[PDB]
Design an enzyme around this catalytic site. Structure first.
Site, mmCIF file in Angstrom:
data_model
loop_
_atom_site.group_PDB
_atom_site.id
_atom_site.type_symbol
_atom_site.label_atom_id
_atom_site.label_comp_id
_atom_site.label_asym_id
_atom_site.label_seq_id
_atom_site.Cartn_x
_atom_site.Cartn_y
_atom_site.Cartn_z
ATOM 1 N N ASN A 32 -25.000 62.921 -38.085
ATOM 2 C CA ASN A 32 -26.312 62.845 -38.727
ATOM 3 C C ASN A 32 -26.452 61.753 -39.783
ATOM 4 O OD1 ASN A 32 -25.378 65.741 -37.995
ATOM 5 N ND2 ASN A 32 -27.619 65.852 -37.796
ATOM 6 N N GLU A 77 -19.734 72.558 -45.553
ATOM 7 C CA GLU A 77 -21.183 72.615 -45.415
ATOM 8 C C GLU A 77 -21.508 72.745 -43.926
ATOM 9 O OE1 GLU A 77 -24.995 69.609 -45.994
ATOM 10 O OE2 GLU A 77 -23.446 69.712 -47.558
ATOM 11 N N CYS A 137 -29.108 67.472 -46.190
ATOM 12 C CA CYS A 137 -28.205 68.285 -45.376
ATOM 13 C C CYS A 137 -28.418 68.222 -43.878
ATOM 14 C CB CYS A 137 -28.255 69.765 -45.788
ATOM 15 S SG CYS A 137 -29.871 70.550 -46.148
ATOM 16 N N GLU A 171 -21.231 68.968 -53.625
ATOM 17 C CA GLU A 171 -20.912 67.546 -53.615
ATOM 18 C C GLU A 171 -21.927 66.782 -54.466
ATOM 19 O OE1 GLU A 171 -20.999 67.273 -49.246
ATOM 20 O OE2 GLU A 171 -18.806 67.146 -49.310
#
Lengths: 480, 480, 480, 480
Positions: free
Chosen positions: D150, D251, D285, D460
């Protein structure tokens, strides 16, 4: 009980002075007692006691000092009703408000009790593989604490709690109008086990005030000064401190803008205005609120405000059931209020609700609400406390902020709005140390209180309060 | 290059003044230039420029201000050799030391560049489910920065870096003896892109010093004062600040004890003593080191110290290869050194290595080492800088600590020992703001520098430096 | 009193289970009681109770949760002697040590009581003038707490205190060997006013241990796991947690190096060794100390160590005056100790002081000291607890550090030295989570405890403990 | 340039593997290159290189590591356009979005560059006058970094920047779909001067993925694992980590609720929805947004949303001017999108704007908007990324929060509202790690990113990111 005292408290002992001064109930005029009127001699003696106690107190473990501060807190709670009666007796504020102050006062001892074990040093990375960098925090030493009459108890504990938690000792010079609360704390300090010389109180009358104030703010044995009061006295003490470069934290009385924007919830703004100006159970500051209302909501606000004043305010003796408005502290106070009202009216102002002395006379004045007030109408009254609320109309947010930001004003600020973006703009642009959003009673021991610009120096309460009584020490551990 | 400037720097422009004052090389006596001698008029103008720039600068994002501060840093590094020559030319200190200062100076801009994006507010829990507590940190505003001649560059950047990183603007009043370093920084500030009015420099001569100092420390547009210099001037500025309750950070010159205990590594203690007193490539403070040596190691220490002075110290012009001892700043300086030496000897002191003017004459004095010096021999010379080292003998640790802790002394401290427990005791008991353990050069931009008691107020450098230029704002978000 | 309990504690109620398991005094063998032996069914029920209590508890103000935690602390102190007797009865450790644990246990409740009001969020600067960045900290939810028998009380409070202070609820699964201390805490939790479901205890026997452990470490309603015990069980729970990505803090039993360097103070090193290995009144970790002694000081150390063992160690029943060495927890424990001793000797080791079962028999073993032990002699005994001290000789500091740093070992470390530089090197190079310098008893509730590498995850106690039970939430307040 | 690489990067060298795997442009299908397909052997070799580099890197001063990280940042900026083209070429995302990611990616290196010098230890007060308590923070060691396709660049720097700033080294295993960005960073790392073995990249194909993933998440030389990807893979790695108790930050991909309340500013909510779902220039995200709209504003919102999709979305090749919607990553991706659309419609859903493959075919799908979608319609598609927006209607705030809080969902959350009180309620009640208020693009390197519950572990970016790569060490300096 044995809470009402008339002697000074020095080195763990009750000491009378050569002279004394009367303390009277501001509501009834009744004599409360003859309190020791400490002079320069006694002030130096108190400083010495605080100084010698310091050398030992700094050595007591943080956990032990923490424990002692908590015991002092528990004792306050155990005697909270009598402690509240003392405040009402000397300051005249209604019992409810007095009960409110005592809680805050006690909560300050408890809060710093917890802070005492959290004075953290640092370990910092430095390029040289030759050394390590350490940062220690240590107590400043003896601190002179000078407080006003407005909040005879909370103003002392928020300072003394931080001081003691850091490992400092103190010499307290309470307001001549309200010395009992300071001495009641002394009684409990001894019951709690606070070592002699750690907490000293030297009451004194108006005539000894200057002399004593100078003595403790100049003594070589004092390393820190903490003052809350008028700008005039504050600047005088700041000069005394200048001669020996003492650390100072200060809070000077002034105006506090209360802004009501068009999108505000009216009843809430009014309720906030009410609690803020007439039924203050907090202790935020020695700040007097004045109102700025936007044209759109203006009329509706003024009308609802006055209606609430008529429905909720009951002038009378603070010990009586249902009293909501106690007396002003003294005749001079009444005079200053009269001044502001008359000069405002003589300039165009309109009285909405009785703006004269109350029928009870003495120190009572009628809760007053004036509209059509202008910006310039507040001059020379920046430090006039009393049940007086002048409403100033404004058209735009920019306008309101500019009016509020008149330099010299930087303590507390308040405003009502329902616009998320406006809330952030005003809160950040308002030049004050504390801002209340859609809330008029913002006191909280865990939050930092103080002013910006000429309204003060330093903060009290919260995680930052203890820093005012600490010194950083950089330690370069080399030879590695 | 275009680094040497003679005009003041205000609002991004080079402006000459009605008058000028001469700046001469302290070593050769050669004329360096005619620098603008700013008066009260120009000082107010500079304050206004700083004030108007503030309103915009505070609005610039922390990342952008951070970026600008770093560019300024990079420019310093790119011109570091010429910047070092300027320091040596005006302060007279040897090139090596000058190179050392420039690095520190540049490192301060870099360090605060990184701090700029780390000004963190807080979110605090309060009992009432009615509100949330926020704490914002905002820049104070305009700060008056006044620096000494000792470290003409590092003393400015450590202050100005913190100020700008916080979002404040500044007006710099450099020492008449060394104004070039301040103006060289200005040239680079403009090359870096620092907006006009953010960094202003107003040089002035001795006769204008008082007037100008008062103008900027009293101007209603100035909210913060940062000073590093003599105690006399410092107390004078503190009084000016008192009249408008300005925030102040200060560092006053004084003595710094250097203690050598019996278990110390002799060669190391001597090396530390050397670097500390004669070859200081740092910038710790405007503090002059004096020695306390324990009887046991005394003789051996004094002997090795003198031997090192004879082997490593070469008096001469700071630009010449191998020079280790430059000139004193002026004739008055030499006179003060002569005074201390003569009065010490006339009281029992013994000179170990030449204690008179150097054969080169002018401003040069011979590196001097005296022993058999007594505690009282240091009176009225607490602020006498120069290549003079008086050694005082002591028997016990308690004794050494008591001597060192003579109030009025609270800046830096140093000591050599190999006893772990002793190291912790002395480091904590020494009443100073900075302590060096088995190390004489403790400068570090990431560590807090400053004094305790009358040696100063506040700290510079490290994570605490930026706080001196910030104000806390408590925001009670209610209506929930 | 009503402190000794045999039923599980769930949802504020005492609940018996279908089965029960015996608990016997490790010293005398006497039956202490039949404790509920909770199964999977009861574990899920407890989780549900904790989960539903959470939804309410998270809503209670930090000040109220703080107050409740303190009341729980005060109750512990008020019953400290009986609480200590319970520990001695079930774990067998001498009363003094038991009294020591109770203090630490109570101090953990008090410490976190103070931490509860200090969960601070942040306000961060971001370039876009469009938004503001907030960081909130919120409780994770339900936490499964699993503790060993070694410190049946302190191991629970350090975890549960942090959990509750953060706003989480817990389900405690105590060690089958020592469940009483967990249930005694329950009795006091209810007396303190801790709401039902906030503190649950589900005792269970060895045979139900696996099943129950899996049930609570896999239940969808549990969001956090906190375990202190063997590496084998720990890895099994870590796998259970992996399937639902639960947060985990863990501490696994292992070896702890105790290094004595040539410059150490012998009597101190021995005293430290004594307190550390035989008279541990602390609770640092489920770590067994082993000694590394430098050749130079070796002989002298071993001799003085043995002499102290003979003079201070008195094997007997923990309730009897003067007992210094209680029994091992069980027969398996004795067997493991015998193993290590025999295999060590069969490889060259030399016994200095009786290395066999004590004449009292049962679970008592003689305090044993062996020298000439080698590095490899510690294999497969990394988790063998008991009064057994193998001394390994080394020549150099580098050598000692390499031996100590054998991976798998990363909990506590100790060493004696009088060299300042060596102290910093070893403290930083030792691969463990905790280091004691010239001190063998380093327990402190205000400091972080835990291991590195395979010795654990996370830390307990101090300002960092509460973070293990918190989640950060970034809030981008835009639309500005 | 020399930015496009096909070999693995280990120990500062470019190393080919026995095999290779093809990387194709997701838009055009064109071959981009044959990249090394590292196997277990090469993974262990990389770990060893990282491990040996660690022993040296941990020794480099924070200032030097800081400087190196900044040089790496500057190199990224200098090559930002080519770095952006690489992202677009391999991930297919439009250039603008790619440029946006590169900035964020670079900003992460810069941010941690600044964090490197701010790893602070603590000095804590303990009752015993016998010792002092120190807390040091040290790097964990080698960290295995595994990232998704991504955000092929930003996902690596946010992790690696923190790791290196803390003093750790890393072994990066990039996504097979987008390995170039990871190798381009390698080229710049070497140009920057990052020492060999500090930054290693081991590309591998789908078939080697499992094997390699296990090798690095189980190797005894690896002490930390950092993963961002699917829940399935994440749980598999968590099990590998369990066997050696490694530290893990994680994550996992999932759904992100985007709630629009009745008082929201419609155009803003739509704009936010647009940027959030179709033109994401951030990197928040691996979360796919789904919409919850209140009945009152529903129709108006859906209509304006669709109108904006028709006016602003241009499907095409990411390198072409005006492209706003690039291709899906692969055929499987298209299939999953088709699935969700069809199953939704077959259950009552209504398509508002084309919900089928785009006329360009290949990997392009039409931006789709569906309404009348129900809660249950999202099952088994929690990890389906693509230009698909299902709108679910709700009546009350309570209802919306309950829907959003469906466990398993705890990464990012968004909502639009103009009610101050509602804003605080929803922001605090939404069970996610990140919340956007009236803003759809909330990426910021100075803020903490991560999930709650099963969406992840750790955070993070911000001041908290570096903690994931640090271990606390309690040092009890006794013997005092």
């Amino acid at each position: 009980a044995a809470l009402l005292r008339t002697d000074s408290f020095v080195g763990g002992r009750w000491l009378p002075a050569a002279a004394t001064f009367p303390v009277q109930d501001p509501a009834s005029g009744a004599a409360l007692g003859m309190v020791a009127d400490c002079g320069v001699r006694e002030a130096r003696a108190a400083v010495r006691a605080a100084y010698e106690a310091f050398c030992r107190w700094r050595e007591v473990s943080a956990k032990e000092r923490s424990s002692l501060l908590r015991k002092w807190y528990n004792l306050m709670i155990q005697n909270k009703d009598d402690l509240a009666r003392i405040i009402t007796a000397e300051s005249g504020k209604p019992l409810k408000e007095a009960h409110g102050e005592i809680l805050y006062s006690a909560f300050f001892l408890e809060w710093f009790s917890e802070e005492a074990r959290r004075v953290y040093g640092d370990i910092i990375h430095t390029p040289a593989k030759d050394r390590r960098a350490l940062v220690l925090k240590q107590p400043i030493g003896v601190a002179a604490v000078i407080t006003p009459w407005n909040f005879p108890s909370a103003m002392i504990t928020r300072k003394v709690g931080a001081a003691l938690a850091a490992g400092c000792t103190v010499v307290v010079k309470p307001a001549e109008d309200t010395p009992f609360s300071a001495l009641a704390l002394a009684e409990l300090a001894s019951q709690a086990g606070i070592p002699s010389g750690v907490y000293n109180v030297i009451p004194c009358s108006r005539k000894n005030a200057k002399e004593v104030g100078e003595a403790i703010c100049t003594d070589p044995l004092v390393s820190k000064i903490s003052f809350t009061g008028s700008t005039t006295t504050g600047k005088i003490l700041l000069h005394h401190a200048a001669n020996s470069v003492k650390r100072v934290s200060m809070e000077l009385g002034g105006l506090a803008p209360f802004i009501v924007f068009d999108s505000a919830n009216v009843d809430q703004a009014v309720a906030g205005a009410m609690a803020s100006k007439f039924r203050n159970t907090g202790q935020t500051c020695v700040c007097s609120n004045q109102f700025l209302v936007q044209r759109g909501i203006h009329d509706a606000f003024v009308k609802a405000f006055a209606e609430a004043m008529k429905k909720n305010l009951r002038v009378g003796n603070g010990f009586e059931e249902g009293t909501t408005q106690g007396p002003l502290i003294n005749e001079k106070a009444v005079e200053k209020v009269e001044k502001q009202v008359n000069d405002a009216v003589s300039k165009g102002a309109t009285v909405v609700t009785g703006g004269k002395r109350h029928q009870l006379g003495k120190n009572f004045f009628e809760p007053t609400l004036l509209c059509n007030v202008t910006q310039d109408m507040l001059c020379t009254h920046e430090e006039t406390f009393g049940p007086l609320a002048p409403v100033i109309k404004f058209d735009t947010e920019e306008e309101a902020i500019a009016i509020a930001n008149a330099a010299d004003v930087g303590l507390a600020g308040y405003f009502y709005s329902q616009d998320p973006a406006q809330i952030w703009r005003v809160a950040e642009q308002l030049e004050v140390g504390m801002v209340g959003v859609n809330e008029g009673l913002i006191s909280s021991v865990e939050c930092p209180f103080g002013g910006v610009k000429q309204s003060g120096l330093g903060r009290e309460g919260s995680k930052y309060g203890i820093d005012e009584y600490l010194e950083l020490k950089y330690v370069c551990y080399g030879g590695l």
